[PDB]
Amino acid sequence: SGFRKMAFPSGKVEGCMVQVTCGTTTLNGLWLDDVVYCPRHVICTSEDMLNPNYEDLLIRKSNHNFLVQAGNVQLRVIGHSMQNCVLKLKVDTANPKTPKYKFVRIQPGQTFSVLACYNGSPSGVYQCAMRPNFTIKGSFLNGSCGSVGFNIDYDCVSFCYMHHMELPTGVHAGTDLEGNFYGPFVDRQTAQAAGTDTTITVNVLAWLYAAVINGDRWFLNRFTTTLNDFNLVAMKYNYEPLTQDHVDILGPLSAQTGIAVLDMCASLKELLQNGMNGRTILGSALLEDEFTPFDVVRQCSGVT
Amino acid sequence: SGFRKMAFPSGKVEGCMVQVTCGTTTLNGLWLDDVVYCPRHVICTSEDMLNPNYEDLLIRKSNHNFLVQAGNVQLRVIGHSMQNCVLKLKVDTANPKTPKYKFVRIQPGQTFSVLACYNGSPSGVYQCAMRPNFTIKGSFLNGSCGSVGFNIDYDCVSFCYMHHMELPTGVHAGTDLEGNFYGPFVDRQTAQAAGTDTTITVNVLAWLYAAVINGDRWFLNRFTTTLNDFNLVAMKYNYEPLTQDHVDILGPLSAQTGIAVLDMCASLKELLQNGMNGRTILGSALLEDEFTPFDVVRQCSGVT
Ligand SMILES: CN(Cc1cccc(Cl)c1)C(=O)Cn1nnc2ccccc21
Ligand SMILES: CN(Cc1cccc(Cl)c1)C(=O)Cn1nnc2ccccc21
């Protein structure tokens, strides 16, 4: 027992990290097979930042201007192309450490691990959620661009995120591995509105089930609710409206604990209306929304 | 910016994990050079659990009874020995993936990453602190024994923990890599008192400095305190007494923010006496003590 904000083991992704330098800028790249993927803003300089013309900036660059180094070994670049906001640098050597992998676009509310890197070297790994407004609340410093987010399903790494930017508000924005931003963001150094965010209701309910499994039960009550009534409370407290699809995804946890989903909703309703009264749930004094129902079952069953 | 409970990249440790089976029991082992380390309770059966006679149980075992498998490859055991609560199985092949490593005994209040494993396969990685009472609040299920805790200093893995037991209270106990338990615990299925725990004051102060660095400043006040006065408050709230050695370790963070350590102590004193007033610090509604001053600087500087 016990419940922690667990990240996937990062080894398979560490083997893919490289450093990419173009001119004066250095960031991280992801080397899979014979292609290195990195943020296209590696081609920008300090003046280019407010509104770069990426097509023009890339036309001034040749294969030999992209310096790619895998630890201490230099990679030979034999092609380059921009796809949305990523650059794809074709190299003459397939990464011998390429794991089985997929590129996936994750949905808002889903979770993933981030391997924060600097100069192609891994610094740390943490788990987070893609917010409903398509930002992530990560831990990134200058030089972390090109660090990736991923999930692992047995031996397959599904890459879902590449880091590109820290908005002036201190929240993070990035793209899928085809270079499409999550959310309305653009790769320019400008203030950009991130929409209104909400709390991921289905994840808070999953985490209350994790709490019951792991012995924290004080919040269980004698009440029940309906989806309609619960959604009036979710509206008031800026929580995502709960749907039958969310109730269905919570089925396994409901069966494992014997607590009907709407009864757990009534516990969540009372916690939203009354707060925690200075008590904690799984070591937290707030309602946690960064664990999906799949994460809770995975952590509570021991999946490798 | 941003601050997360970051674990070290786990790749170097994933390469060392193996499965060890003796009789009916399977747990994890750590393969470094030509030795596999694992908890000695791999030799116990269901009857042996209340008070195993480990010397007698091990005398019934031969090298060929220890089944060690590295992924899918079987290791040949050419020697076995018990050192405190660990078994050391000498194998005929040095692990080709052995990183540069050390065995260290960590101090209470220090932090480390855990790579949770089942059947020799990594499941997830998380960061935690060794509590002042020598327990850890981890996330472990049956089969996780032999999972290890570690820190990484550039290319060197310092292994500090091997998991052995979940106490009836749901907290975790284990040993250094020489098999010495942290705390008063013994490897038997009995209720065992874990001492009175305290909150790691120097880590809470380090985390308040991380909060100021990362923009959360609301808790800063117009006050100062002394070590003596602060320690009366620490006593009341079950916090570790602060010493000049702790103030010295906080020197770098104090210099980076320009906030004198005793002024930060006055902010911590007001938070202890008044609570958070329904506000948060770095996404937490409680005072966090699982980040050391070294962790905060490492995360805020980008060390790889
Ligand atoms: C370089 N820019 C802005 C930007 C992004 C895209 C294109 C352009 Cl042309 C300019 C960043 O925001 C890089 N960044 N990403 N995470 C960070 C964390 C802390 C400090 C900086 C960080
Ligand atoms: C087998 N024992 C008890 C024990 C420990 C040492 C020696 C003996 Cl003889 C018996 C455990 O506590 C193993 N364990 N460790 N973490 C766990 C998490 C959840 C469930 C079980 C877990």
Q: Which residues of A touch B172 (CB under 8 A)?
A: 2
Burial of A242 (0-12, 13-18, 19+ CB in 10 A): buried
In our burial notation (b when 16+ CB lie closer than 10 A, e otherwise), range A207-219 reads bbbbbbbbebeeb
Tell me the one-letter amino acid at B104.
Answer: V
Residues written for chain A:
304
Technique used:
X-ray
For residue B146, give the nearest of B37, B25, B64, B16 by alpha carbon: B37
Of residues B7, B9, B286, nearest to A285 (C-beta)? B286
Q: Which residues of A touch B280 (CB under 8 A)?
A: 286
CB contact under 8 A, B119 and A304: yes
CATH code reported for the domain at A198-301: 1.10.1840.10
Phi-psi region of B245 (alpha: psi -120 to 50; beta: other; left: phi over 0): alpha
Ligand 1 centroid to residue B214 C-alpha, Å: 16
SS3 of chain B: the string is CCCCCCECCCHHHHCCEEEEEECCEEEEEEEECCEEEEEHHHHCCCCCCCCCCHHHHHHCCCHHHEEEEECCEEECEEEEEEECCEEEEEECCCCCCCCEEEECCCCCCCEEEEEEEECCEEEEEEEEECCCCCCECCCCCCCCCCCEEEEEECCEEEEEEEEEEECCCCCEEEECCCCCECCCCCCCCCCCCCCCCCECHHHHHHHHHHHHHCCCCCCCCCCCCCHHHHHHHHHHCCECCCCHHHHHHCHHHHHHHCCCHHHHHHHHHHHHHHCCCCCCECCECCCCCCCCHHHHHHHHHCCC
Residue A22, SS3 per DSSP: strand
**Is A300 among the residues known to form the active site?**
no
If residue A230 lies in a helix (H) or strand (E), which one and from where to where? helix A227-236
For residue A266, give the nearest of A200, A220, A203, A202 by alpha carbon: A220
Burial of B24 (0-12, 13-18, 19+ CB in 10 A): exposed
Ligand 1 centroid to residue A143 C-alpha, Å: 8
Least Cα separation, residue B117 to chain A (angstroms): 7
For residue A259, give the nearest of A300, A304, A223 by alpha carbon: A223
How many Cα atoms sit within 13 Å of A5 on the Cβ side? 21
- Positive or negative: CA dihedral A40, A43, A48, A53: negative
Q: Which residues of A touch B286 (CB under 8 A)?
A: 280, 283-285
Of residues A123, A284, A301, nearest to B304 (C-beta)? A123
**Is A246 among the residues known to form the active site?**
no
CATH code reported for the domain at B15-99: 2.40.10.10
Of residues A2, A166, A304, nearest to B122 (C-beta)? A304
Closest Cα in chain B to A275: B278
For residue A207, give the nearest of A289, A304, A294, A264 by alpha carbon: A289
The backbone torsions φ and ψ at residue A29, rounded to the nearest 5 degrees and listed phi first, read -130, 160
> Which numbered atom of ligand 2 lies nearest the CA of B40?
7
Alpha carbons B49 and B188: distance in angstroms, whole number: 6
Alpha carbons B21 and B137: distance in angstroms, whole number: 26
Tell me the one-letter amino acid at A266.
Answer: A
Q: Which residues of B touch A137 (CB under 8 A)?
A: 2, 283
Alpha carbons A124 and A71: distance in angstroms, whole number: 16
Query: What count of other Cβ atoms lies within 10 Å of the Cβ of residue A35?
Result: 18
- To the nearest 10°, report the CA torsion of A31, B119, B116, A207: 100
How many Cα atoms sit within 13 Å of A11 on the Cβ side? 18
Alpha carbons B269 and B234: distance in angstroms, whole number: 8
Q: Atom 7 in ligand 2: which residue has the minimum CA distance?
A: B187
For residue A242, give the nearest of A223, A268, A216 by alpha carbon: A268
Q: B17-22 and A172-175 as β-strands: parallel, antiparallel, unpaired?
A: unpaired
Closest Cα in chain A to B151: A124
CB contact under 8 A, A170 and B214: yes
Ligand 2 centroid to residue B140 C-alpha, Å: 10
Residue B205, token pair as written in the block = 């102060």
Please pick, among A16, A22, A38, A41, the residue that the annotation labels catalytic.
Answer: A41
Tell me the one-letter amino acid at B106.
Answer: I
Residue A136, token pair as written in the block = 């992530």
Closest Cα in chain B to A121: B304
Q: Atom 13 in ligand 1: which residue has the minimum CA distance?
A: A165
User: What DSSP designation does A129 have?
Assistant: E
Unique residue bearing structure tokens 């109730």: A247
Unique residue bearing structure tokens 């993936």: B97
Q: Which residues of B touch A69 (CB under 8 A)?
A: none
B1-14+100-197 is a CATH 3.40.50.2300 domain: no
Least Cα separation, residue A197 to chain B (angstroms): 15
Query: Is residue A217 a contact partner of residue A209, using CB atoms and an 8 Å limit?
Result: no
For residue A185, give the nearest of A35, A41, A28 by alpha carbon: A41
Say yes or no: do domains B1-14+100-197 and B198-301 share a fold. no
Query: What count of other Cβ atoms lies within 10 Å of the Cβ of residue A287?
Result: 22
State this model's resolution in angstroms.
1.2
Tell me the one-letter amino acid at A9.
Answer: P
Q: State the helix-helix crossing angle for A201-213 and A261-274, rounded to 10 degrees.
A: 100
The backbone torsions φ and ψ at residue B145, rounded to the nearest 5 degrees and listed phi first, read -55, 140
Question: Which residues is B27 bridged to in the sheet?
Answer: B20
Ligand 2 centroid to residue B143 C-alpha, Å: 8
**How big is the CA angle at B219 (ends B213 and B221), to the nearest 5 degrees?**
105
Query: What count of other Cβ atoms lies within 10 Å of the Cβ of residue B222?
Result: 6
Contacts of B11 (CB under 8 A, 6+ apart): A9, A10, A11, A12, A14, A15, A122
For chain A, which residues make up each domain, given as ranges? 1-14+100-197, 15-99, 198-301
Phi-psi region of B227 (alpha: psi -120 to 50; beta: other; left: phi over 0): alpha
Residue B290, token pair as written in the block = 């699982």
Spatial strand order of the sheet with B86-91 comes to B73-75, B66-70, B17-22, B25-32, B35-39, B86-91, B77-83
Residue A190, token pair as written in the block = 């400008």
Residues near ligand 1 with C-beta < 6 Å? A 41, 44, 48-49, 52, 140-142, 144-145, 164-166, 187-189; B 1
Contacts of B220 (CB under 8 A, 6+ apart): B212, B259, B267
In our burial notation (b when 16+ CB lie closer than 10 A, e otherwise), range B164-185 reads bbbbeeebbbbbbbebebbbeb
Query: Is residue B76 a contact partner of residue B94, using CB atoms and an 8 Å limit?
Result: no
Q: State the helix-helix crossing angle for A261-274 and A227-236, rounded to 10 degrees.
A: 30
Alpha carbons A185 and A181: distance in angstroms, whole number: 6
Closest Cα in chain A to B165: A1
Question: Which residues is A86 bridged to in the sheet?
Answer: A39, A83
Q: A100-103 and A156-166 as β-strands: parallel, antiparallel, unpaired?
A: parallel
